């Protein structure tokens, strides 16, 4: 169905425009010089609060993506017709976005990306 394809395209355009704004909120409070000492998230309250707000945002993105992926699978299972080159929901994002990368997206929504690890995990 073209409908779920449209929803995934709209969701992915919205996600790629919000993600750098969300990461920049963490950088403002959590970034520091690479000095071999504790990351700011270990004890700086405005950094810890920024991480909590990013975690709320990315958790919501993961839940939305899970809903849309299941709708994609339900649609592919109920319809016979195919869309060329489209096997997964990632192929819709790859086809419509500029330099969408599946591993980067999967890492971001699972808090395994460099920004969340380097800014929000204490070490």
């Amino acid at each position, epitope marked *: 169905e073209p409908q779920i394809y449209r929803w995934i395209r709209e969701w992915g355009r919205d996600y790629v425009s919000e993600l750098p704004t969300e990461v920049q909120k963490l950088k403002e409070k959590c970034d520091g010089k*690479i000095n071999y000492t504790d990351k700011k998230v270990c004890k700086v309250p405005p950094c810890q609060n920024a991480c909590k707000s990013y975690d709320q945002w990315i958790t919501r993105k993961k839940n939305q993506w899970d809903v849309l992926s299941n709708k994609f699978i339900s649609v592919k299972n109920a319809e016979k017709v195919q869309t060329a080159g489209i*096997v997964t929901p990632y192929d819709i994002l790859k086809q419509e976005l500029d*330099e969408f*990368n599946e591993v980067a997206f*999967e*890492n971001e929504i699972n808090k395994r990306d*460099g920004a969340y*690890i*380097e800014l929000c995990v204490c070490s």
Partner: antibody
Amino acid sequence: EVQLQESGPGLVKPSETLSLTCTVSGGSVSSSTYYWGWVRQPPGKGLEWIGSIYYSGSTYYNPSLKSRVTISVDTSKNQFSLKLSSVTAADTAVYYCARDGTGALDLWGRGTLVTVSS
Amino acid sequence: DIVMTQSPSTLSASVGDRVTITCRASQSISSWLAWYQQRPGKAPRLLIYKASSLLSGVPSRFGGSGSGTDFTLTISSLQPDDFATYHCQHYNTYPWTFGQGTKVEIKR
């Protein structure tokens, strides 16, 4: 399309330092999601991850090399680099630069053979 | 560190055969395992990540399975361009380490 391009000498004398650079083209080294890494494959042997770096400058190194390896990043030149000191012929290998998705290396350079010889 | 051990070291199969490569971890790595293919004169390419997720753009004949310590890469229908060395790699914790590689040769 993002491409990784290695550069640096193919011949290094024993005891000197091997230096290689990876230039990102069609994309940016200033990725808030990815790390950037180096992997090597000595002739007729297995792959060995050397280390990875985040665009902030944070690094992770294989303990097999941590006492003689330095990985750097230059976001103003869209590049990252490797320096391996005190090389021996055991360091002769194909060296690859790679985009490191926190363990899943999803894009690799073509590789550069570096021979350690006098 | 974690040691990854692949088997067999080499295998020969005909076009259309089902090929299986195993990878065993010295300790549990959950599903943090990747499979790479290295075709002649080329740098490796990622085929599978998270033990069973097929990367977009990679042929559907590649599949990954397993969890904990035992993993398998299966090529459901071997093709001539599958002549390559296949490598497993864990990413459970640093350092990332690879198996020794498996060479797949074609019979004709």
